[PDB]
Write an enzyme that holds these catalytic residues in place. Structure first.
Site, PDB file in Angstrom:
ATOM      1  N   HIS A  65     -22.268  20.074 -18.880  1.00  0.00           N
ATOM      2  CA  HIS A  65     -23.645  20.405 -18.431  1.00  0.00           C
ATOM      3  C   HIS A  65     -24.756  19.704 -19.248  1.00  0.00           C
ATOM      4  O   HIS A  65     -25.688  19.495 -18.648  1.00  0.00           O
ATOM      5  CB  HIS A  65     -24.176  21.936 -18.637  1.00  0.00           C
ATOM      6  CG  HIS A  65     -22.946  22.924 -18.063  1.00  0.00           C
ATOM      7  ND1 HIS A  65     -22.981  22.687 -16.754  1.00  0.00           N
ATOM      8  CD2 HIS A  65     -21.737  23.547 -18.493  1.00  0.00           C
ATOM      9  CE1 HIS A  65     -21.568  23.918 -16.607  1.00  0.00           C
ATOM     10  NE2 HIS A  65     -21.420  24.303 -17.626  1.00  0.00           N
ATOM     11  N   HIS A  95     -29.904  19.806 -27.575  1.00  0.00           N
ATOM     12  CA  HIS A  95     -29.298  19.178 -26.442  1.00  0.00           C
ATOM     13  C   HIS A  95     -30.588  18.730 -25.931  1.00  0.00           C
ATOM     14  O   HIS A  95     -31.611  19.119 -26.304  1.00  0.00           O
ATOM     15  CB  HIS A  95     -28.673  19.987 -25.719  1.00  0.00           C
ATOM     16  CG  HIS A  95     -29.039  21.303 -25.072  1.00  0.00           C
ATOM     17  ND1 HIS A  95     -29.073  22.485 -26.006  1.00  0.00           N
ATOM     18  CD2 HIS A  95     -29.798  21.529 -24.138  1.00  0.00           C
ATOM     19  CE1 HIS A  95     -29.848  23.546 -25.216  1.00  0.00           C
ATOM     20  NE2 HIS A  95     -30.180  22.816 -24.414  1.00  0.00           N
ATOM     21  N   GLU A 107     -37.742  20.943 -18.140  1.00  0.00           N
ATOM     22  CA  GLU A 107     -37.413  22.239 -17.645  1.00  0.00           C
ATOM     23  C   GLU A 107     -38.759  22.928 -17.618  1.00  0.00           C
ATOM     24  O   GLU A 107     -39.286  23.276 -16.476  1.00  0.00           O
ATOM     25  CB  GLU A 107     -36.494  23.103 -18.396  1.00  0.00           C
ATOM     26  CG  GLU A 107     -35.092  22.329 -18.489  1.00  0.00           C
ATOM     27  CD  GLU A 107     -33.850  23.394 -18.580  1.00  0.00           C
ATOM     28  OE1 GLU A 107     -33.762  23.975 -19.786  1.00  0.00           O
ATOM     29  OE2 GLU A 107     -32.958  23.402 -17.780  1.00  0.00           O
ATOM     30  N   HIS A 120     -33.925  20.433 -26.826  1.00  0.00           N
ATOM     31  CA  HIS A 120     -33.982  21.877 -27.014  1.00  0.00           C
ATOM     32  C   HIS A 120     -33.284  22.084 -28.442  1.00  0.00           C
ATOM     33  O   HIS A 120     -31.950  21.609 -28.525  1.00  0.00           O
ATOM     34  CB  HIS A 120     -33.416  22.838 -26.047  1.00  0.00           C
ATOM     35  CG  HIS A 120     -33.964  22.978 -24.760  1.00  0.00           C
ATOM     36  ND1 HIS A 120     -33.534  23.035 -23.581  1.00  0.00           N
ATOM     37  CD2 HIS A 120     -35.405  22.615 -24.649  1.00  0.00           C
ATOM     38  CE1 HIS A 120     -34.576  23.270 -22.614  1.00  0.00           C
ATOM     39  NE2 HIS A 120     -35.551  22.952 -23.246  1.00  0.00           N
ATOM     40  N   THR A 200     -29.809  28.339 -18.973  1.00  0.00           N
ATOM     41  CA  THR A 200     -28.660  27.999 -18.177  1.00  0.00           C
ATOM     42  C   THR A 200     -27.774  29.335 -18.072  1.00  0.00           C
ATOM     43  O   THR A 200     -28.035  30.120 -19.268  1.00  0.00           O
ATOM     44  CB  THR A 200     -27.589  27.106 -18.700  1.00  0.00           C
ATOM     45  OG1 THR A 200     -26.843  27.523 -19.898  1.00  0.00           O
ATOM     46  CG2 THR A 200     -28.342  25.737 -19.070  1.00  0.00           C
TER      47      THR A 200
HETATM   48  C1  LIG Z   1     -22.907  34.816 -23.997  1.00  0.00           C
HETATM   49  C2  LIG Z   1     -23.166  33.176 -24.492  1.00  0.00           C
HETATM   50  C3  LIG Z   1     -23.573  32.392 -24.808  1.00  0.00           C
HETATM   51  C4  LIG Z   1     -24.171  30.916 -25.334  1.00  0.00           C
HETATM   52  O1  LIG Z   1     -24.501  30.202 -23.854  1.00  0.00           O
HETATM   53  C5  LIG Z   1     -25.585  29.484 -24.104  1.00  0.00           C
HETATM   54  C6  LIG Z   1     -26.115  28.856 -23.124  1.00  0.00           C
HETATM   55  C7  LIG Z   1     -27.037  27.795 -23.063  1.00  0.00           C
HETATM   56  C8  LIG Z   1     -27.572  27.463 -24.324  1.00  0.00           C
HETATM   57  C9  LIG Z   1     -28.584  26.603 -24.256  1.00  0.00           C
HETATM   58  N1  LIG Z   1     -30.045  27.235 -23.836  1.00  0.00           N
HETATM   59  S1  LIG Z   1     -31.379  26.596 -23.623  1.00  0.00           S
HETATM   60  N2  LIG Z   1     -31.018  25.506 -22.523  1.00  0.00           N
HETATM   61  O2  LIG Z   1     -32.040  27.581 -23.137  1.00  0.00           O
HETATM   62  O3  LIG Z   1     -31.736  25.991 -24.971  1.00  0.00           O
HETATM   63  C10 LIG Z   1     -27.055  28.051 -25.446  1.00  0.00           C
HETATM   64  C11 LIG Z   1     -25.920  28.747 -25.396  1.00  0.00           C
HETATM   65 ZN   LIG Z   2     -31.480  23.683 -22.873  1.00  0.00          ZN
END
Ligand SMILES: CC#CCOc1ccc(CNS(N)(=O)=O)cc1
Ligand SMILES: [Zn+2]
Ligand SMILES: CC#CCOc1ccc(CNS(N)(=O)=O)cc1
EC number: 4.2.1.1
Length: 260
Positions: A65, A95, A107, A120, A200
């Site tokens: 992703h 990331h 975003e 992020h 996500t």
């Molecule tokens: C249950 C669970 C879990 C961890 O899943 C994630 C999903 C996205 C992200 C990054 N999120 S963002 N894009 O809002 O910084 C970190 C961990």
């Molecule tokens: Zn992110």
């Protein structure tokens, strides 16, 4: 998540996520458009404190992703405090989200303006013990978002650009020690903040968003390399990793506060 099948394509993209993650239509979803005229200066917001001097990066991973630069978060080594936050938040990874073209990729948007990418830096509230428990809390994570525009190169980002050749496809990782995330910050720490979610799946509403006003500049060559990554695994049909961003979601009952 061994049976998850969400992505950014036409058949499993953002418009489809709600079928397996109903919170996608929740009350505090991210990202959002930041209307600069409606955000209000909040005098009670303490200065932001980014202490990354002892940061210990370990690895870089293409997860299908995006790519994550992971840190050792078993001790208070790189933490975010202050601003709208109560307590200590530890950096676990950072990331980016980027586009297929320089005109899109971020975003969050500013007065509907889309940037070429968005960084992020994900942090979790140490009062919850670990990241897994933290994501189950309304104030479990603090994500520092930084916009990227295309112009001059960002010296501090090159080590990341150069290692991407080694993690081209989903599941590949590479040792990535001694990378200093301070080299990815803009000069000013002025920010907007609002309560939101992971952008996500699982889209959990556990994030305090802190989005910096000042973007950093990266070169076209640097972002070009991001666009050469693959969403697919090795030995599969090549699908370039581009446009891995979720569009702005309804602000609903929230106010964006400005630190300036
Ligand atoms: C249950 C669970 C879990 C961890 O899943 C994630 C999903 C996205 C992200 C990054 N999120 S963002 N894009 O809002 O910084 C970190 C961990
Ligand atoms: Zn992110
Ligand atoms: C070949 C094949 C196949 C299965 O395709 C899909 C398409 C969409 C989805 C929806 N996933 S979601 N709701 O998480 O975005 C799942 C599987």
């Amino acid at each position: 998540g061994m049976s998850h099948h969400w992505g950014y394509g036409k058949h499993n993209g953002p418009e489809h996520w709600h079928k397996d993650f109903p919170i996608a239509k929740g009350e505090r979803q991210s990202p959002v458009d930041i209307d600069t005229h409606t955000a209000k200066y909040d005098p009670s917001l303490k200065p932001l404190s980014v202490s990354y001097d002892q940061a210990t990066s370990l690895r870089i991973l293409n997860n299908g992703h995006a790519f994550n630069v992971e840190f050792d978060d078993s001790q208070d080594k790189a933490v975010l405090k202050g601003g709208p936050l109560d307590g200590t938040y530890r950096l676990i990874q950072f990331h980016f989200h980027w586009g297929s073209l320089d005109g899109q990729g971020s975003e969050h948007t500013v007065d509907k303006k889309k940037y070429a990418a968005e960084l992020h830096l994900v942090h979790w509230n140490t009062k919850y013990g670990d990241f897994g428990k933290a994501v189950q809390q309304p104030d479990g994570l603090a994500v520092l978002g930084i916009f990227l525009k295309v112009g001059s190169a960002k010296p501090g980002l090159q080590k990341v650009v150069d290692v991407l050749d080694s993690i081209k496809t989903k599941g590949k990782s590479a040792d990535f020690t001694n990378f200093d995330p301070r080299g990815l910050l803009p000069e000013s720490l002025d920010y907007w903040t609002y309560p939101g979610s992971l952008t996500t799946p699982p889209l959990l509403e556990c994030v305090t968003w802190i989005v910096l006003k000042e973007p950093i500049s990266v070169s076209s060559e640097q972002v070009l390399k991001f666009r050469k990554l693959n969403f697919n695994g090795e030995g599969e049909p090549e699908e370039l990793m581009v446009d891995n961003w979720r569009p702005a979601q309804p602000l609903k009952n929230r106010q964006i506060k400005a630190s300036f």
